[PDB]
């Protein structure tokens, strides 16, 4: 996260770290058994780390749970990074508590100009922010027209842009798969962009609200 601030610890208790020997992507707990992340973060098995603030220090709030299932959206495409959404089933349920709480799936698609929060342990491009401590940033949803204008013909129905076209504030490498929360619901998944925090190149997010039927049907299986 570029141009943000250190989150109040555990103020984003749905935020998880996906780990394969090291942090490589974020995700969001959506109930005690499932995490939503980005398809481009796929690995066939991952360790989900919940209850984190400082991913380098053992704080006593953590739960580390291996995945049992990693499910890419069936129509994920790297041409465009389209349908950039994945479900991770936990091999055992998470214990919900002060530090670990699921975020709700959207009851609507948030409109342009809605202010949201994005968070992660990705690159901060900053001499004073510490990516080891979960970072937070408030970003507004941009219009489809501004989004498409920034990346002509690459913005599909499954994407939205959010952030600041003037630059300086954005999600970045290592934030991928993490949440965009708007009015307390998971509206976005950190997906792609040209660079980070560059003028005219806003962040692009998977648009969770149009995936709800795929998400809930997939989670209904056991």
Which residues are annotated as part of the binding site?
A: 52, 54, 57, 62
Q: Which among 84, 119, 131, 150 is annotated as catalytic?
A: 84
40: annotated active-site residue: yes
Q: Which among 14, 23, 40, 53 is annotated as catalytic?
A: 40
Residue with smaller CB distance to Ca ion, 16 or 190: 16
What minimum distance in Å lies between the beta carbon of 175 and Ca ion? 17
Task: Show the beta-strand stretches assigned E in the chain.
Answer: 5-6, 15-19, 23-29, 34-37, 47-50, 63-72, 86-90, 115-120, 135-140, 159-162, 179-182, 185-192, 203-207
Closest by Cα among 121, 130, 140 to 187: 140
Residue with smaller CB distance to Ca ion, 59 or 130: 59
Which residues are near Ca ion by CB under 5 A? 52, 54, 59
Task: Compute, in degrees rounded to 10, the torsion defined by CA atoms 100, 184, 141, 154.
Answer: 50
67: annotated active-site residue: no
Rounded Cα–Cα distance for residues 167 and 151 (Å): 15
What are the binding residues for Ca(2+)? Answer: 52, 54, 57, 62
Give residue 197's region: left, alpha or beta (phi > 0; psi -120 to 50).
left
What minimum distance in Å lies between the beta carbon of 111 and Ca ion? 36
Residue with smaller CB distance to Ca ion, 121 or 205: 121
Nearest-CB residue for Ca ion: 59
What minimum distance in Å lies between the beta carbon of 152 and Ca ion? 42
44: annotated active-site residue: no
Residue with smaller CB distance to Ca ion, 9 or 167: 9
What minimum distance in Å lies between the beta carbon of 196 and Ca ion? 24
Q: Are 58 and 216 in contact (CB under 8 A)?
A: no
Q: CA angle at residue 18 from 73 to 114, to 5 degrees?
A: 65
Catalytic positions are 40, 84, 176
């Amino acid at each position: 996260i570029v141009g943000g601030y250190e989150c109040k610890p555990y103020s984003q208790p749905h935020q998880v770290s996906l780990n394969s020997g090291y942090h490589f992507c974020g995700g969001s707990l959506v109930n005690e058994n499932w995490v939503v992340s980005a398809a481009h973060c796929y690995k066939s098995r991952v360790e989900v780390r919940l209850g984190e603030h400082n991913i380098k220090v053992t704080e006593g709030s953590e739960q580390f749970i291996s995945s049992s299932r990693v499910i890419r959206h069936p129509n994920y495409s790297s041409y465009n990074i389209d349908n950039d959404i994945m479900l991770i089933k936990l091999s055992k349920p998470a214990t919900l508590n002060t530090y670990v709480q699921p975020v709700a799936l959207p009851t609507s698609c948030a409109p342009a100009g809605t202010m949201c929060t994005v968070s992660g342990w990705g690159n901060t491009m900053s001499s004073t922010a510490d990516s080891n401590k979960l970072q937070c940033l408030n970003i507004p949803i941009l219009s489809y027209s501004d989004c498409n204008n920034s990346y002509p013909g690459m913005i599909t129905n499954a994407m939205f842009c959010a952030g600041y076209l003037e630059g300086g504030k954005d999600s970045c490498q290592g934030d991928s798969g993490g949440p965009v929360v708007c009015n307390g619901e998971l509206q976005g998944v950190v997906s792609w962009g040209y660079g980070c925090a560059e003028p005219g190149n806003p962040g692009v997010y998977a648009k969770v609200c149009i995936f709800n039927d795929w998400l809930t049907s997939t989670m209904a299986s056991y």
